[PDB]
Amino acid sequence: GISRDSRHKRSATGAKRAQFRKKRKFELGRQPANTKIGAKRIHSVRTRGGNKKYRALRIETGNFSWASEGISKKTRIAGVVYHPSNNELVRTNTLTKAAIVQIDATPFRQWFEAHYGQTLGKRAASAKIESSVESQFSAGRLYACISSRPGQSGRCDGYILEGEELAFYLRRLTAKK
Amino acid sequence: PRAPRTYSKTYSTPKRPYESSRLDAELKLAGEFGLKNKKEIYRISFQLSKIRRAARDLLTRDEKD
Amino acid sequence: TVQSERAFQKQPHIFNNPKVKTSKRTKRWYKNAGLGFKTPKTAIEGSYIDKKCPFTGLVSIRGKILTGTVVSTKMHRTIVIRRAYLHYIPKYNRYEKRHKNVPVHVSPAFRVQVGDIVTVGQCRPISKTVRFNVVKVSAA
Amino acid sequence: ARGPKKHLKRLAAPHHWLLDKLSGCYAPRPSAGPHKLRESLPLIVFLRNRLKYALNGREVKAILMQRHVKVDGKVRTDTTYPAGFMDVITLDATNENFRLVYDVKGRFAVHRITDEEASYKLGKVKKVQLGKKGVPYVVTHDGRTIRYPDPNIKVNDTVKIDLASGKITDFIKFDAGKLVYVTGGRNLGRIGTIVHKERHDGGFDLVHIKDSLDNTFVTRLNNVFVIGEQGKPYISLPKGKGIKLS
Amino acid sequence: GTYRKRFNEKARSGHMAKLKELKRIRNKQFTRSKVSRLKKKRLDKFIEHQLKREERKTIIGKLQDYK
RNA sequence: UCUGGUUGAUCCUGCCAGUAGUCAUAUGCUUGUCUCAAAGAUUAAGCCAUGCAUGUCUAAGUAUAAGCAAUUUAUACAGUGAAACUGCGAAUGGCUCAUUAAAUCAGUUAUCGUUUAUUUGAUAGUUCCUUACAUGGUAUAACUGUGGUAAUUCUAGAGCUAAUACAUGCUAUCUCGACCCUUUGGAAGAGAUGUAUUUAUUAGAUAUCUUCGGACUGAUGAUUCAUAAUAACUUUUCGAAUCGCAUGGCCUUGUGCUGGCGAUGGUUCAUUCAAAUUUCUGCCCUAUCAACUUUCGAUGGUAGGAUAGUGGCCUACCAUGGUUUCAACGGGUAACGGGGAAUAAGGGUUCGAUUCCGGAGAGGGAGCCUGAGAAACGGCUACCA
RNA sequence: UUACUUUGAAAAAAUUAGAGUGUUCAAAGCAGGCGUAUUGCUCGAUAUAUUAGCAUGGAAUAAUAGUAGGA
After folding, report:
1. Can you state the subunit structure given in the record (chain E)?
2. Chain E contact present for A18, CB below 8 A
3. How many domains is chain C built from?
4. Cβ-Cβ contacts under 8 Å for A68 (sequence gap 6 or more)
5. Which of A2, A22, B7, C14 could form a disulfide with A29, with the two C-beta atoms 3.0–4.6 Å apart?
């Protein structure tokens, strides 16, 4: 089905190129893995060389890193909120790169309690965090940008949205609601 | 899928093949030297033509080139 | 403005620590494209984000280098130049004029106007027709 | 083709093998190895067409499976192994060592070699790099990876390698005034001292060489190969010492 | 040549399909049997001559009433 | 490219006569020797009876053949070896030029934009961490037997038994060093310690005394490169339950400890044989073909998907762009491209399916499995003929 | 500054043009032979931008850039 040659497109001048060969194997494409949220389910695809490549069909958990603290914790992904390519992906809960998902916040706030001796909500300069991040902690979900390619590696790894990106995507969410 | 052996034509018919002076020339040569063929006389004349053409070009080139 | 798109434009893997307070509120990454091309201070102290700017993006300049005369500047961040050359017809023992319109990317760190002489360097395929990148602009 | 070729026609072969164009259609395609395809001498070409120690490929098999041939200290048994340039090929029953090195006419050249000279081998350090666990290595012109080199070894510098331990004995820098062998291109086999490295950026650095009759030519850095200092080649050159004449 | 007359179009079934599609997409710029043709032309001329005959006769009728 | 003819003779314009070759294409007659050599053509890349053209074993993966040799050291096996499992190859070679006119191709570049079986060189002690390693477990083939069918390299049910099949899995070394007494150092104590996948972060910068003996990171023209470190993550990898010849060193005389040559394998990195993209410039006839491309991706931007990877390659959301009288687009080609072949004084012109190189195809659309490598056709599937 | 010119590297073999050699001649084909071989001796093995790219030398031609004001 899918192939990705450049012999079936129009020319640069706007001409129609006649066919040159049959489709080749080294210009194949494969069917997208619309990775949704559910119990973990992952295919393995054999790729050029003998190289394995894991596709994710449904994945629940993920590894999310707090960049300002430089740490990483495994959390549970709740649901996709924003995605800059397709609000149909937002609707159907597809997990891709550059998606904006809400995650659980309990391991992050547990690490924060055990590391700074202070709860969240309701070494002080180190304990001080940002206001929107504190609001999300009080809410119970954290905004995090996915930065992995779950149709390729089968992992959903992201980073918690820090100040400037959080401001931009908060404006985006509030304007698009 | 071999390499081609090279062959080459060893003689060459002259420009005007029928001419009384050249016919009597080849009669003189064939009867005097015991030949049998205009093929043989054209063989020798072709060799001499090649030689004299090479010599003429080396004349026209510069001395001590 | 910088954030005029649906996604957040950024320099990838370049991170500005929020707990660390410094003077320059962003952290910008810039390189020099070699070959004696002076990187512009507008690209050093700019504010744009461009994946294909040869001084700030992930694009190398390598191999061939051309110069051209700009023809059209109507599409976003790419121009079209026109190289001219003299082809030689050995039958008629004289020449003829020809031209090839090569489309080429331009960084937002440059200001081209239709008519000047630019110098472009070959990079990896940016788009369908864009394989070069404007690296040194000169007026006329 | 849908994969790698395994055959080589007779006229497709590299010219300097001196393979005569009637004894068949195929020439020993040299197997993958240390040296590149267009500048390698298979052992069948060396033993049969050059030394005349064999009359057939079956006799070359008989010799190699008898385990007489050693190429750089180690036994080879593949008859199309790519023995390249600056190689040591020892035949023990014949008591000969051969340095493979080019002649002036552009072809390879048997060089009879004694034991004390066969014990080592030059190699053009071509890629110096930092490997895993933070160790440095050099990659010479025959694939030889040598971890832990001297810190002053750079690209394009000759390294004299002790064979029986695979180690770096010493090295020869790349400066003007060294003795330079030329390996590829039109002038290959012309041993001359290097005068000036004309250096461009992104292009190819040319090299101006001047040899003993004070004749001057230009090659590329890819074809230049440093041997030794002025008048002191580390190896023994073939006859004529690499001088092109009239 | 793209549009020749081959030997076996019944074997060149799919070949002719892709060629016809190519011709359509190419000459979209422009769009966006001879004996039978002679019989068609002479048929049109004959039926037109008969219409000329009938209209001639009714004009004769018109003028003979109008005199 | 020339010669002959008008008229008393002469010059140009004319008319006629005369002349040519062609590995050109058919064809006719003749044809003894020696050497050498080719062996397509209906614009039919139209159709095939039969036969063959791809298989493979070393001392070194698996033999209880109810195979053979007896027989002499071999009561686990040991020689040779059908069959079958396993490994590799079948992706090269051979044929043909149907398609394709900036396409293939030629010369020139790039990969700081990727995959690579093999070959070659390097490479991995992680010691401990609470409840078999003198070496775990399942099956299945071939085989024995019971059968089906008009038929094919069809195979079903039942009983065995193996692995380099398949699936599991455990087996100290550095730094500092108080002391001591001094050499030949050895020492209480303090401290550290795999790869692989994915993400986040960090580094990867470089305009005075003497006991004369001793103390006061790299590369490129250029990188987010090589490399290192931190925190976690994984339906998660690897870190040898393999094989041949020999039998030496030890001794607490245990059938205890150690040990040579070499075969297969395996993570990463480099190399080689490659592969895919890729930059400049170059194609025959056509203007009584002047506008063409964009719904159906045409030109660019951003994000994602997909791929080995770049990329409108594809999906979104966006701007309205791109080519052309320097000939775009579309048409014709009895168009595979090139090295090359013929000819003339030079210039040119005409051939090039055809011994080498490259591309494409296997009756024609389409699709895939295995594999490092195929959109394979002496592989498989569906359609048409 | 470029065009244009000079030179150099690059333009696979086979083909072509050349040099050697008594295949019995020839069309072809191929690339040493002697020695006191314990240290040497002899000859030949060259050329083929036709445009693009790369490097280089220029004194013409043809385009192409750059003195002025005030006190």
Report:
1. Interacts with snoRNA U3. Component of the ribosomal small subunit (SSU) processome composed of at least 40 protein subunits and snoRNA U3.
2. yes
3. 1
4. A162, C17, C18, C19
5. A2
CA-to-CA separations, D5 to D1, D2, D8, D21, D31, in angstroms, rounded: 8, 9, 8, 21, 11
Technique that determined the structure: cryo-EM
Any residues with CB less than 8 A from the CB of C37 and at least 6 apart, and which? C61, C135, C136
DSSP D173-210: ---TTSEEEE-SSTTTT--EEEEEEE--SSS--EEEEE
Helix (H, G, I), strand (E, B) or coil at C137: strand
Give the C-alpha separation, D236 to D227, whole Å. 10
DSSP string, A61-124: EEEEEETTTTEEEEEEEEEEEE-SS-HHHHHHT---TT-EEEEE-HHHHHHHHHHHS--S---H
Please list every residue in chain A whose beta carbon sits closer than 8 Å to the beta carbon of residue C18.
Answer: 68, 130, 162-163
DSSP annotation of C57: S
Show which positions of strand F are touched by protein (CB under 7 A).
36-38, 43-47, 90-95, 99-104, 109-113, 115-123, 196-202, 217-224, 226-228, 230-236, 268-283, 291-294, 297-317, 319-335, 347-349, 355-368, 370-377, 383-385
Q: Among A65, A168, A169, A171, pick the best mutation site for testing chain C contact (most C Cβ within 10 A).
A: A168
Give the range of the structural domain holding residue C45, as residue numbers without chain letter. Answer: 1-140
CB-based contacts of A46, cutoff 8 Å, min separation 6: A52, A53
**B8 beta partners:** none
CATH 1.10.168.20 fits A106-140, yes or no: yes
Give Cα separations from C119 to C57, C84, C138, D207 (angstroms).
18, 14, 8, 29
List the CATH number of the domain containing C137.
Answer: 2.40.50.1000
Q: How far is it, in rounded angstroms, from Cα D199 to Cα D155?
A: 14
Please give the Cα distance from D172 to A23 (Å, whole number): 53
- The partner residues of A42 in beta bridges, in order of sequence, read A56
Tokens 């001292």 sit at which residue?
Answer: D193
Task: Write the CB contacts of D183 (distance below 8 Å, at least 6 apart in sequence).
Answer: D39, D85, D102, D223, D224, D225
- Cβ-defined contact of A68 to C6 (cutoff 8 Å): no
Count of other CB atoms within 10 angstroms of residue D246: 2
Domains of chain D and any CATH numbers: 1-116 (3.10.290.10), 121-171 (2.40.50.740), 174-244 (2.30.30.30)
Alpha helices by DSSP H, listed for chain E, are 13-26, 28-31, 34-66
Q: In angstroms, what is the C-alpha Rg of chain C?
A: 18
Count other C-beta atoms under 10 Å from residue D69's C-beta.
Answer: 24
